[PDB]
């Protein structure tokens, strides 16, 4: 669940 839709 870490990170995201963009770099």
């Amino acid at each position, epitope marked *: 669940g870490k990170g995201g*839709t963009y770099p």
Partner: antibody
Amino acid sequence: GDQSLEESGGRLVTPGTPLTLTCTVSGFSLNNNAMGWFRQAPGEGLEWIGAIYTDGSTYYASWAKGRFTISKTSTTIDLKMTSLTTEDTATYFCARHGYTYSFNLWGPGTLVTVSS
Amino acid sequence: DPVMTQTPPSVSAAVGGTVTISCQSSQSVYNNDNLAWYQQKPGQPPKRLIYGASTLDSGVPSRFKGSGSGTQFTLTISGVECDDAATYYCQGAYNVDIYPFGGGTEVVVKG
């Protein structure tokens, strides 16, 4: 597009007084993006405080565990701080996680002043 | 819990010169390249310049170059300009749920 963050809640607080900061997000979903909180004491370096992942699981810097709590709504994250001392005086920033696991969007910051 | 160490603490360079900043990680970063560089000027939020050790973020001049893999990384500013006076930070990501920052390097530009 209009992707942004904005922190609020920073004020003067006496040592021991609890404070909650809020980070209001625009233009993206907290179901698809993790978020972090960071701070920078005056004249000192950036430091990570903790993170909240898309499922609402939380992760803290060793020193922040137990004293700092992160929660979120559909459009905000918060940072509930307790046992504040003068060492917690800093600018507090929220930032968005990217899939490279660095932070790709930052708010302007809110100032917490712990003082008698 | 991984630790980033950045050197030097400070550096001065003349306009049109080259600055080189180093970051060492205590453990291998995730996928050997999850290492980012940020610029921060006084009273402003940090601005990510580089992600994945070598990819320039959007609205970042080509004079900024990131290199390295594993535990050793470099940021080079090739043709420093007065707009590049700032403090620079490195940040690793890992198998573990920790997002540590380097201590910073202040860049002073001699005009």
